[PDB]
Amino acid sequence: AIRDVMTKFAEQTTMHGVPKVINAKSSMGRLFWSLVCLAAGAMFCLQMSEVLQRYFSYPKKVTVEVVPTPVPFPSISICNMRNLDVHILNTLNRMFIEDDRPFSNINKSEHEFIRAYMKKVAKYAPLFWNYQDEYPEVFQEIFSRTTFSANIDPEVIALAAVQLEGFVVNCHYAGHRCNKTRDFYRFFDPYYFNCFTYKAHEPTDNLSEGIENGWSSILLSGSGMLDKNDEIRMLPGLHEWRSAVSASEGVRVVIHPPSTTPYPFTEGYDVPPGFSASFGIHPRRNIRIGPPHGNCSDKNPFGDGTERYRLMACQKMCMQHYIVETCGCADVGLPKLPLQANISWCRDDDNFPDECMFTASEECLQLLMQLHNRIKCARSIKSKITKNTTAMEACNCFPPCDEVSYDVSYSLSKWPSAGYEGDAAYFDVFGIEKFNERFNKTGTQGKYELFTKYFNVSNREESMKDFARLNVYIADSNVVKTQESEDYTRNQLVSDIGGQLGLWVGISLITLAEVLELIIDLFRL
């Protein structure tokens, strides 16, 4: 009864072609309707192929718009490009001017950093005296800032690096004066040594003064108080030989989201002394989608999770991972991995015997060359690894799923104007704020005398050039939001499938139930 059951189906069915094929009277009609059905089916299959290819490509939809929801004021990190304090530097210079032998200077000072510095330098003095004309580049590499950072306790370096009270003259945010010991947080950078991060404090203060729409500060950044030697002398720990930031004067300014670690060596802006820098912030917000549509992460694979995630940190720790894997040591210019901490710096030199303080023996020279080779290994890995897409993709570093970013307008003006307004600025710094009297203390008197001589009223036109002003403000209150979204949802897929199926063949799922009922009836044939 196959023909009879198919005829019963054709009598009561909603399919468009099958009843005409089954009930066809002419054989030519049957052929025509079979061809019509096959053409409709093939066209439907092709259109579904394209539709499902689009769906399983998992496209993304991106909107760019300005929104009124405000961002919090960004964290501002300021680093003086000079690593050490001016009085400490002058003391070191004068100490070498009275005795050029660093060994004899170990017990000449009660400052901890000076004793450590003299002891570290003394390990290299005979080698420098005997081989500076044969290996100048080696000694320039080894007397860099980063070797002292790697080999002296940062809590000892912090006693000689730039101090907050001697760096920030004035600070204003949201119409009130800053509380320096409350709002500035000190952190150590292997190249800049002491750096300070400002965290905004909203009005609760009675000190109603300053910029209302942003942050402004006056910074002592020049080096004009330092002694001018009549001939060139080696002062280790000051110059990062042939680094792109080496021997520069000014302030390094980093604008970054609040609870994030800054990386002043590879991000931020430069400000020269004697200038006023305006930073016009345009805030941005990027929202991203997960694995099938893209890649984004909410946490750093290498971190402990205390920081707010930034891709830069992940990439830097990936670089450190590969450096540690290849050279067997860590680079001071990158974070140390929170996994292991028994890893030594590549620039470590505690291996040096104390006899190298007295003799320029071949063993000391070989150790010097080995340290140079370790530095070269680290530098080579740093230069090569970021071009290697396999290694970089193996670290699973993906952009944050909800990222706040800033576009900064940058411009400069000569801050202390010649003439009367410069007089007013000088009086504000030294008459009202009384900048020098911060150093009228038993432990800082020498610096007090230095600043009293340098910043006297007569020499103001030249001496005020050592200051720089930063003016950081939000230019546009609205945030430019870039949001990812899935372009082709499952509902859109279902609707398009319905459209295609209605256009070509006219099937509905209730009609697929017709064919299922026919199949069960054939099972009962």
């Binding site: 070498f96 050029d100 660093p102 500076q132 002398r233 080696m234 280790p236």
Partner: peptide
């Protein structure tokens, strides 16, 4: 010759 360079001195310290």
């Amino acid at each position: 010759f360079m001195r310290f």
